Design a protein around this nucleic acid. Structure first.
Ligand SMILES: [K+]
Ligand SMILES: [K+]
Ligand SMILES: [K+]
Ligand SMILES: [K+]
Ligand SMILES: [K+]
Ligand SMILES: [K+]
Ligand SMILES: [K+]
Ligand SMILES: [K+]
Ligand SMILES: [K+]
Ligand SMILES: [K+]
Ligand SMILES: [K+]
Ligand SMILES: [Mg+2]
Ligand SMILES: [Mg+2]
Ligand SMILES: [Mg+2]
Ligand SMILES: [Mg+2]
Ligand SMILES: [Mg+2]
Ligand SMILES: [Mg+2]
Ligand SMILES: [Mg+2]
Ligand SMILES: [Mg+2]
Ligand SMILES: [Mg+2]
Ligand SMILES: [Mg+2]
Ligand SMILES: [Mg+2]
Ligand SMILES: [Mg+2]
Ligand SMILES: [Mg+2]
Ligand SMILES: [Mg+2]
Ligand SMILES: [Mg+2]
Ligand SMILES: [Mg+2]
Ligand SMILES: [Mg+2]
Ligand SMILES: [Mg+2]
Ligand SMILES: [Mg+2]
Ligand SMILES: [Mg+2]
Ligand SMILES: [Mg+2]
Ligand SMILES: [Mg+2]
Ligand SMILES: [Mg+2]
Ligand SMILES: [Mg+2]
Ligand SMILES: [Mg+2]
Ligand SMILES: [Mg+2]
Ligand SMILES: [Mg+2]
Ligand SMILES: [Mg+2]
Ligand SMILES: [Mg+2]
Ligand SMILES: [Mg+2]
Ligand SMILES: [Mg+2]
Ligand SMILES: [Mg+2]
Ligand SMILES: [Mg+2]
Ligand SMILES: [Mg+2]
Ligand SMILES: [Mg+2]
Ligand SMILES: [Mg+2]
Ligand SMILES: [Mg+2]
Lengths: 65, 102, 61, 91
RNA sequence: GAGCUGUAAGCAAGCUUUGAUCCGGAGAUUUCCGAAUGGGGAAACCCACCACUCGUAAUGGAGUGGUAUCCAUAUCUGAAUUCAUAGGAUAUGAGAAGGCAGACCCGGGGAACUGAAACAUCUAAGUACCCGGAGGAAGAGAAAGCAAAUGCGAUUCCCUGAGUAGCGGCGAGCGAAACGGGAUCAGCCCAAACCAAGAGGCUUGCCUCUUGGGGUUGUAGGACACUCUGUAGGAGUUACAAAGGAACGAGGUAGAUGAAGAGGUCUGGAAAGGCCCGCCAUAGGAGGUAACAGCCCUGUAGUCAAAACUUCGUUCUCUCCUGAGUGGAUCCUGAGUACGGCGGAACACGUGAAAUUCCGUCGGAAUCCGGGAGGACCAUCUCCCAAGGCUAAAUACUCCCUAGUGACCGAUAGUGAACCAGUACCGUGAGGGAAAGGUGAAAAGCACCCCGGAAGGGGAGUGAAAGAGAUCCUGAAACCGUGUGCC
RNA sequence: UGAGUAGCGAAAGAGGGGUGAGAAUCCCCUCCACCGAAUGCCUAAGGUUUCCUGAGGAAGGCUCGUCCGCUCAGGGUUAGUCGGGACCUAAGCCGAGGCCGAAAGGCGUAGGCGAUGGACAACAGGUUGAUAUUCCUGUACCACCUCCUCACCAUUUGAGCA
RNA sequence: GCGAGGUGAGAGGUGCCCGUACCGCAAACCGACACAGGUAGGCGAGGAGAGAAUCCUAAGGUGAUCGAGAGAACUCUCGUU
């Protein structure tokens, strides 16, 4: 998900998707440990998606202050 | 680089001087290109799992980019490369004729 | 340290000289006397040079 | 903190496989995580009932690839015993 | 603008013209330690309290923020003690702290070896070193000066004066300055008299203090009076008061564009080389490319380019702002100061005939009919006005960044370090401190067969070359061998 | 060069069987021999993976090597009660203010830090190739907590806490 | 001092961090070495014995990281005369 799409969402909506992504990232790491994960590229994708959403949240806090 | 993947180029230097071919791949970091039919090498591959049998494989090896030139669309001769802005987009142009390479 | 609060007179270095003119290091101390005076508008026992007390502007408290 | 920050990954060994028959699950956890945080994290994520958490620290192992010597990361391993009347974790 | 997921091959899984990787501007995130600052601690660890938040029936657990010391300001309490004050508490602080560039600068403290053919004065040397303080420069600086002219006009630095004058167990040695020629140039603000207003001691029309005005000097100036005159032209944040904004121009931090030969032919693994012909050139810098390239590539000359941040300049805005004359009634013009004795230090100058400057100690002026200097001192003359402050430039230096240069090095050299080096190693520690570059144009890095457990080799293949096959360009000598012509 | 020389660092082995390209040297067996107030068992400091399993044999091992404290993989350390901290203090160390001192700093009060000491609740058995008062079985104990239960005492000479 | 709710018993519950492998009279620590050296503390059996002496043994541990011969001088450590 891109930063332009994330900015459409509300702060509560973004924070819910961060929680959803951190659930996905957890499951990927478990699948990696057991050796069941084919699409290893998804880990890097989810990590950067979390980073992108947390960046947007912090921009709003700085904009608020 | 002055050429890219997909371009028909003439090899202007080396053993394959005179031979035309399409750029199968480009290596900007090394300033090398892989031209089809040019600079064939005989690799001595051991039996792997990926390649099960092995054997002596004839394959292209990269040549230096400065040993190729793109063909002029009009004449079919080698040309140096200029750039013009057309429709906002930058395009390569053959310096010999004037026409767009890409 | 040994420093006058008013003037800032303190220990300074120089030479002893013998008759044969041999130099060896020594100090000159200020003639500091511990006295009660106003320091930031309140009595405090502090070093003041006898020279700084000479006029009597530095009032004893 | 997030529960899923606490638990890094499951330990899949012969020892850990033997522990799973006894209803004990071995996790690599955050090196800062205490055993109460681990207990809470497992109950939150997997929806199970923990009996107890035993926890241990592993030093980094000295390692070599050619000339260059170095250390592996230090690890915190938690052995999480579930209660008798509890759902099993699905690894 | 077409590839990309670094060294780093490799499989794997992906990303990318719906613009990735990559480059530059501005942001965000930024564990723990460290001044380290909640408290502790054997740095990178441990343990808290107070808010709020998550979680539990609750305890235990978790998250975020605050909580050092000193200093400044304010407020509230106010001991012995009456008022008070000390002390305590709380709040506000982009207040301090620490680091470094092994440089340059200014101070505090300050050696010795050494030289003197010994050595003590002296030298080395105010060096090294330690300490404090800085700043982009610092220090100095607007005459109590230089001098001895029908003078000069702040300081600093360069040349020169000059190895002179001088100093000196008159030994060893140390060693100016002014004039003259240059670089650069800039001058200012107070203190005091006095005036105005307010405050608290009434000392009771006096005095002290705090603001604003006034004022700034030497053949004296100012206050004070006079008459003038200005209150917005001139000045300005580099001193001369101090903040801010816009616009325009030129730079910096990415980039863009960019002329002309695969000319023919000859060797060759390959042509940039030879030979014979062209052509471009505001471009014949450079690097690369299979051998030596202005015309192959990246470029170069020239010409362009910036959303953003940033530097400089300019203009406006903005802000601030009277400065000339005449009079000598009085008043003011830097006090424990100048200066002197004693003891030291600094001056090129070693106590000397010893001016000049500074420190300790003690003594201690005059104050315009006054004071200082002109190398003891006095007189005369000349020049100047101390004991308050500020001040750019010319000057010094380079950890860095950008571009470039060298009758500088080329792997025992050049940095200690061309390479994963302040590493390995050594030492309890401070600290000491290495060795080690080259396959090939390209991995085309030797499929396959044979001996061998492997190592290693012989073929085969690749390559121009394998006696270029991995500390793989060349491959000297010592040294070690095999063969044998003569002895 | 010396030179195939000095040396190969106190010590009892022998044979049989095995493994392997290879065995005086590795494994197993038998008998023999050595230590036994230790050459045994536990545990500090210190070391820091040397531990266990599988594979390996260039180098290291004063020989050899199929073996190893060596090389390569993968694995292994479980605590309310043990030792240390969330307890206490000694020597000493640090030290708000403070005293002293050219600078740097020195000293020191309150207050802290600091075990080698004080205090302090868990035992027996079992188990793995590798941990065990830690895991498991049985049976305990200590501190704290209250959705609860029961009893008792008490709401200003009023229990109780301290 | 603090105080409207306490106290005792039961029942239910809570209990964090650090160390824990292995060597540790040793080839793993200090001695440059797989070095006849050094390395705190606990336990330390039997016979005969006063004993932790001494000799031989127990539990338990170990056979020592160059060997095979020969059995000259000489040197060393021993025994006898
Ligand atoms: K001397
Ligand atoms: K001499
Ligand atoms: K080329
Ligand atoms: K003098
Ligand atoms: K004096
Ligand atoms: K003068
Ligand atoms: K060197
Ligand atoms: K010969
Ligand atoms: K004995
Ligand atoms: K082995
Ligand atoms: K253990
Ligand atoms: Mg060109
Ligand atoms: Mg534990
Ligand atoms: Mg001498
Ligand atoms: Mg400055
Ligand atoms: Mg600065
Ligand atoms: Mg200055
Ligand atoms: Mg100013
Ligand atoms: Mg171009
Ligand atoms: Mg040609
Ligand atoms: Mg060549
Ligand atoms: Mg004056
Ligand atoms: Mg004279
Ligand atoms: Mg060389
Ligand atoms: Mg070198
Ligand atoms: Mg060391
Ligand atoms: Mg050769
Ligand atoms: Mg070459
Ligand atoms: Mg060679
Ligand atoms: Mg022999
Ligand atoms: Mg001999
Ligand atoms: Mg011999
Ligand atoms: Mg011998
Ligand atoms: Mg031996
Ligand atoms: Mg015996
Ligand atoms: Mg082992
Ligand atoms: Mg060997
Ligand atoms: Mg204890
Ligand atoms: Mg102290
Ligand atoms: Mg203090
Ligand atoms: Mg103790
Ligand atoms: Mg106990
Ligand atoms: Mg064990
Ligand atoms: Mg153990
Ligand atoms: Mg030993
Ligand atoms: Mg007996
Ligand atoms: Mg006995
Ligand atoms: Mg006899």
């Amino acid at each position: 998900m891109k930063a332009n799409e994330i900015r459409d969402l509300t702060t509560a909506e973004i924070e819910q998707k961060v929680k959803s992504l951190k659930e996905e990232l957890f499951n990927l790491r478990f699948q990696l440990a057991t050796g069941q994960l084919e699409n290893t590229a998804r880990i890097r994708e989810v990590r950067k998606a979390i980073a992108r959403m947390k960046t947007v949240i912090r921009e709003r806090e700085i904009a608020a202050n | 680089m002055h050429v890219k993947k997909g371009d028909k180029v003439m090899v202007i230097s080396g053993k394959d001087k005179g031979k035309q071919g399409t750029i199968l791949a480009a290596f900007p970091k090394k300033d090398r290109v892989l031209v089809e039919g040019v600079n064939m090498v005989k690799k001595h591959s051991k039996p792997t799992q990926a390649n099960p049998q092995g054997g002596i494989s004839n394959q292209e090896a990269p040549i230096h980019v400065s040993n190729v030139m793109p063909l002029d669309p009009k004449t079919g001769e080698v040309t140096r490369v200029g750039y013009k802005v057309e429709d906002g987009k930058k395009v390569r142009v053959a310096k010999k004729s004037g026409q767009v390479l890409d | 340290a040994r420093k006058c609060v008013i003037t800032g007179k303190k220990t300074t270095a120089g030479n002893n000289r013998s008759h044969a003119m041999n130099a060896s290091k020594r100090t000159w101390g200020a003639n500091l006397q511990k006295v009660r005076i106003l320091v930031n508008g309140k009595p405090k026992k502090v070093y003041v040079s006898a020279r700084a007390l000479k006029s009597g502007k530095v009032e004893r408290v | 903190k997030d529960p899923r920050d606490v638990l890094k990954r499951p330990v899949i060994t012969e020892r850990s496989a033997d522990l799973m028959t006894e209803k004990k699950y071995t996790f690599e956890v955050d090196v800062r995580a205490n055993k109460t945080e681990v207990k809470d994290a497992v109950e939150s994520i997997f929806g199970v009932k923990v009996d107890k958490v035993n926890i241990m620290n592993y030093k980094g192992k000295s390692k070599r690839v050619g000339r260059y010597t170095g250390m592996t990361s230090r690890r915190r391993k938690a052995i999480v015993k579930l209660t008798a009347d509890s759902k099993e974790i699905e690894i």
